[PDB]
Amino acid sequence: KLRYVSRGGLKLEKALKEFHLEINGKTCLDIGSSTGGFTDVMLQNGAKLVYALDVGTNQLAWKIRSDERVVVMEQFNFRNAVLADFEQGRPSFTSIDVSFISLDLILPPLYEILEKNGEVAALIKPQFEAGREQVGNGIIRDPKVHQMTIEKVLKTATQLGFSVKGLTFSPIKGGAGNVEFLVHLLKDGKAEIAQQVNIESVLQKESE
Numbered sequence: 001k002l003r004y005v006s007r008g009g010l011k012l013e014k015a016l017k018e019f020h021l022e023i024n025g026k027t028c029l030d031i032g033s034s035t036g037g038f039t040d041v042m043l044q045n046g047a048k049l050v051y052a053l054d055v056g057t058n059q060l061a062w063k064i065r066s067d068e069r070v071v072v073m074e075q076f077n078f079r080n081a082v083l084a085d086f087e088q089g090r091p092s093f094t095s096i097d098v099s100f101i102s103l104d105l106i107l108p109p110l111y112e113i114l115e116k117n118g119e120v121a122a123l124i125k126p127q128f129e130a131g132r133e134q135v136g137n138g139i140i141r142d143p144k145v146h147q148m149t150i151e152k153v154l155k156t157a158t159q160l161g162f163s164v165k166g167l168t169f170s171p172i173k174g175g176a177g178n179v180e181f182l183v184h185l186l187k188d189g190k191a192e193i194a195q196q197v198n199i200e201s202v203l204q205k206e207s208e
Helices: 009-018 037-044 107-113 143-160 199-207
Strands: 027-031 049-053 070-073 093-096 119-124 162-169 181-187
Touching: 009 037, 009 119, 009 162, 009 181, 027 037, 037 049, 037 093, 107 143, 119 143, 143 162, 143 181, 143 199, 162 199
Parallel strands: 027 049, 027 093, 049 070, 093 119
Antiparallel strands: 119 181, 162 181
16 A cells, blocks of 8 residues: 555655646656656646656656656756757646756746646755755755745745745655745746745744
């Protein structure tokens, strides 16, 4: 009864549930596929196709690598990604779980690539969004730094034209032991942060 190929799958599972996302029949993009937990979640929820992208060599679990619905794009730096790179359908849903890089560098090319009214479920990792001097053991524990990193990503998304439809906390810690957050974006050019988005409330709920 391990339902997913990694505990990472628990992260996207919560996003799908909390953000009321529908994957069935959609062409999906998994940025930072790694072992494939996110891809696995999307496959199980009926994705028509999943592009599995990694800046380095693919590390997909055997089960996921062998899946006919999966299109591997390894040694592929998403910063250099353009719409022409996606030749088997335009992604309308995207999940993002990258490390050692800010979403500031991922969201812009993605905004162009994603289908109109396409959606994004993205992990916000304070340890990669804060300043070097702010990090230190590699864990960010300061609530004010957490807030600032969330604010930073929401600002970047809205400046691009994404609307922010939801925000919550990732159900499990990432990497060296970091609280991380899940944000729901919509490509509509409206730059609207939904009323339900409440950073302080999310921070408080994660802490409990």
